[PDB]
Design a protein around this ligand. Structure first.
Ligand SMILES: [Zn+2]
Ligand SMILES: [Zn+2]
Ligand SMILES: [Zn+2]
Length: 585
């Protein structure tokens, strides 16, 4: 028994072809089964033919005869169908509303999640359907990881480099840091974990969670995790207050957090508040500063990534009493300077999926562009708070959608929070970039921030751009542009001070080639997010949807504190770079 996800109607049915098996009421179950290929139905039992060796599962060909279900062929003389009068048969057969359209829920139930439209619907549908869609998606994502062939260690060529043997009659996943493996050692009568791993074309380079002497027969699978059902909405119902509520502001603050006093008050005068923090505008500074402005306030800081929760801890470590902080960790090496897994501690720092059920004065969720509606619901499910602050930047990178291939995913469709920030704007905006040279700030202010992002620093006169298409080669799942790396090699010989630069590209393969030919440290734009470097060398590599995504370009060029060389493929972003142009040697 449960709740129709369209009617909320109390029902004893679930769609057996829907991977999540939503509860559907008589009405909605019918309206679902007669309008889609979804025809298995589950009650306190499965609507299947209890006759011996008949495969009839379809609910539109089944009859309740006695207290056992049967198809046309097997049914007893006295039987009624299971599926007639616009209602499939089950408990609570009287209480059952329906819907003017079931269209959206059918699409969510039956889409494969390859098309943009699927993610758009999941972010414009009713809130109950936002939850259903978020589960359906995450479970579809986790199942697709199983369709991947097992990789097995054939040969250990070196230390940090392997030969992989791959399960036949299955595809192999891409080898970039968006595919994280778990290893396993072969045992008597089962297997045990040996850490998480990542791979890259070599033979294969492997970067593992722990160190080992892993030997032949050790094998690797993308570990999938059981997706829980979602209860809580992605956003609580909003409220606006006329005073600050349940928070007691400090009387003496420091001139370090004084630019945020207005904003911290706003946080106290509404139930939740959206903060857009462009690159190096001070999001974490803002987030810790909030504590000092409400010193009695209990504050759970949360984010999707260990990395993001840890950067909050690093900042906390410099301003908040250590004894009054705790890092929640489930039984990967994360921040270890606060008492571990102490929930009743004033300042709790914890990833979303490891959050305890607990209350707080304020909840600070960071790097929000990386949150899915799934994570939103979980936070609301685990944390009841007087005040929720969602810090992030919808002009930065979302969570990867591995299944997505047809269309691009717009920032207004990353999650419920980013939808709000792109449609009604954010509650607050950190408008001054402390990190980048003026040229980079000017460029992205115009590009993605409506010309409201101002440069704290001057022009560096150290930002350059070159238009060089060069030559694009493709390996299995990545791009390489050797002539763009050539141009960078030639620039470095003439500009040797740039040897302190990081190499960023939108492809880990370009990165690998660059590493061998330049010996610059490398990041993918995605791997670079929330990191700063004095000098950055960016090769666009291709003119793809991927390499020209304005949010990826935004993150790419905002990693520089002092100077940047962009070797560009795309005439459009090339022309949008307010940088000194360079001719080709
Ligand atoms: Zn219903
Ligand atoms: Zn279904
Ligand atoms: Zn039968």
């Amino acid at each position: 028994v449960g709740a129709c996800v369209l009617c909320n109607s109390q029902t004893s049915l679930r769609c057996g072809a829907c991977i999540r098996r939503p509860f559907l009421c008589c009405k909605c179950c019918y309206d679902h089964v007669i309008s889609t290929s979804h025809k298995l139905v589950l009650s306190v039992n499965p609507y299947v033919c209890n006759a011996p060796g008949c495969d009839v599962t379809d609910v539109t060909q089944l009859y309740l005869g006695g207290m056992s279900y049967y198809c046309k062929s097997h049914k007893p003389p006295i039987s009624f169908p299971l599926c007639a009068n616009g209602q499939v048969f089950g408990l609570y057969k009287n209480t059952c509303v329906g819907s003017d359209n079931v269209t959206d829920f059918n699409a969510i139930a039956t889409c494969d999640w390859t098309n943009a439209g699927d993610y758009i619907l999941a972010n414009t549908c009713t809130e109950r359907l936002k939850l259903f869609a978020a589960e359906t998606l995450k479970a579809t994502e986790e199942t697709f990881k199983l369709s991947y062939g097992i990789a097995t260690v054939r040969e250990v060529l070196s230390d940090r480099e392997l030969h992989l043997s791959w399960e036949v009659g299955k595809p192999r996943p891409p080898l970039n840091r968006n595919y994280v493996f778990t290893g396993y050692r072969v045992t008597k009568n089962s297997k045990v974990q040996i850490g998480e791993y990542t791979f890259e074309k070599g033979a294969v380079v492997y970067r593992g969670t722990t160190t080992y002497k892993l030997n032949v027969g050790d094998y690797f699978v993308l570990t999938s995790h059981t997706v829980m059902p979602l209860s809580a909405p992605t956003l609580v119902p909003q409220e606006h207050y006329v005073r600050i509520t349940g928070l007691y502001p400090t009387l003496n603050i420091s001139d370090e957090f004084s630019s945020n006093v207005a904003n911290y008050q706003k946080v106290g005068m509404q139930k939740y508040s959206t903060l857009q923090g462009p690159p190096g505008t001070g999001k974490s500074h803002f987030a810790i500063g909030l504590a000092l402005y409400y010193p009695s306030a209990r504050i759970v800081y949360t984010a999707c990534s260990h990395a993001a929760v840890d950067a909050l801890c690093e900042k906390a470590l410099k301003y908040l009493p250590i004894d009054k902080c705790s890092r929640i960790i489930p039984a990967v090496e994360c921040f270890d300077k606060f008492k571990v897994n102490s929930t009743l501690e004033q300042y709790v720092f914890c990833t979303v999926n490891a959050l305890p059920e607990t209350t707080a004065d304020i909840v600070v969720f960071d790097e929000i562009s990386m949150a899915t509606n799934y994570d939103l619901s979980v936070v609301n499910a685990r944390l009841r708070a007087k005040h929720y602050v969602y810090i992030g930047d919808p002009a930065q990178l979302p969570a990867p959608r591995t299944l997505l291939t047809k269309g691009t995913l717009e920032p207004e469709y990353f999650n419920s929070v980013c939808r709000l920030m792109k449609t009604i704007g954010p509650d607050m905006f950190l408008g001054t970039c402390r990190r980048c040279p003026a040229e980079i700030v000017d460029t992205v202010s115009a590009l993605v921030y409506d010309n409201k992002l101002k440069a704290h620093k001057d022009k560096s006169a150290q930002c350059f751009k070159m238009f060089y298409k060069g030559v694009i080669t493709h390996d299995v799942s990545s791009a390489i542009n050797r002539p763009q790396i050539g141009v960078v090699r030639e620039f470095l010989t003439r500009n040797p001070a740039w040897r302190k630069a990081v190499f960023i590209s939108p492809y880990n393969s370009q990165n690998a080639v660059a590493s061998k030919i330049l010996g610059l440290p490398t990041q993918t734009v995605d791997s670079s997010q929330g990191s700063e470097y004095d000098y950055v060398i960016f090769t666009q590599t291709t003119e793809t949807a991927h390499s020209c995504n304005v949010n990826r370009f935004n993150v790419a060029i905002t990693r520089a504190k002092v100077g940047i060389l962009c070797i560009m493929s795309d005439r459009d972003l090339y022309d949008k770079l307010q940088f000194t142009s360079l001719e080709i040697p």
